[PDB]
Amino acid sequence: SFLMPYSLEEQTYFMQEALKESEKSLQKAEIPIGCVIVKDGEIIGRGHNAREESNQAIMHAEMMAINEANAHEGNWRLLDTTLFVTIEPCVMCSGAIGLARIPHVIYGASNQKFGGVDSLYQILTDERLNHRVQVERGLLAADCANIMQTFFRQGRERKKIAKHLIKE
Amino acid sequence: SFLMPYSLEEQTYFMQEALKESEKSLQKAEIPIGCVIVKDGEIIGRGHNAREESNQAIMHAEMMAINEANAHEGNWRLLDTTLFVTIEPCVMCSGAIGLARIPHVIYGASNQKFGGVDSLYQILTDERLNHRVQVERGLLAADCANIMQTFFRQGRERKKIAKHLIKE
Ligand SMILES: [Zn+2]
Ligand SMILES: [Zn+2]
């Protein structure tokens, strides 16, 4: 039943690759969330949040990775694939993951405010939608949560500078 | 509380425009669902399902329309906008609609199998996500449901021809 296509070291490698995607968003002053989609032990799609830069509301890490994975495979179906994402996917991405037919998802830290996999909803395991995704969580959670904390602190600092310049 | 930026005739015009988008998908042998996003009485985004053609799993009508609307406005935020879609948005699109901050959504026929607005979930009015979208349904439902029925019949016919050619 429970599948294990990759060792813990392999999984760690992939999540760290997603964290590197996460760093791209951070550097661009955006929610530091990264994602990588793997097929046969090879990453076929990468993504990071880029809503502000792209001016696209759907441009979350998972969506970018899915588009890349589909392009790579030249198919909207992403069977026998594993998706690694630093933070629990929101409702939109969860729905997208189900539509892509991705059977395996591994995320780092949970998303208590917008989480659609375990937190607010359980879209990837919902029988009505018949999504039967094997979900794993906790992989490098500390790091995934840490870069997010860095983002928020930097955000307050940027907001403080802006407030100062507007004033006088 | 309840807003009415457009008359019933204006709404009908926009849904018919979404039905025209729906016809594009039908012609390409895809789920005939169309969508239009309106701002200040003007359509700023159009979309239709094109998963098979684009090989993109997220390429539903609403997603295509949102990307177009964001591009038009050069902003991921789609405030003071109204989205018209022939069929009740699925979970992915509903989530996307919430992320775009679209305050008004009008759909034709309901989606009893994958509906994320009223059928399976109520994402657009979920307090946890604080989405406070004004939802209207039923606009030209008969037509929206009709073109879908046409799609399924044509699908069976295409499947029958394919079965015949494979055989002998
Ligand atoms: Zn998301
Ligand atoms: Zn959808």
Curated annotation (Swiss-Prot), chains A, B:
Pfam families xref list: MafB19-deam
CMP/dCMP-type deaminase domain segment(s): 9-136
Annotated positions binding Zn(2+): 60, 90, 93
Cofactor note: Binds 1 zinc ion per subunit.
Any one GO molecular-function label of the UniProt entry: zinc ion binding
Keywords: Hydrolase, Metal-binding, tRNA processing, Zinc
Enzyme Commission number: 3.5.4.33
Domain of life: Bacteria
GO biological process: tRNA wobble adenosine to inosine editing
Claim: Metal-binding is one of the keywords in the record: yes
Top class in the EC scheme: hydrolase
Catalytic activity: adenosine(34) in tRNA + H2O + H(+) = inosine(34) in tRNA + NH4(+)
Active site (UniProt): 62 (proton donor)
Cofactor: Zn(2+)
Subunit structure: Homodimer.
PANTHER family, alphabetized: CYTOSINE DEAMINASE FAMILY MEMBER, TRNA-SPECIFIC ADENOSINE DEAMINASE
Function: Catalyzes the deamination of adenosine to inosine at the wobble position 34 of tRNA(Arg2).
Family under the similarity heading: Belongs to the cytidine and deoxycytidylate deaminase family.
Official protein name in the record: tRNA-specific adenosine deaminase
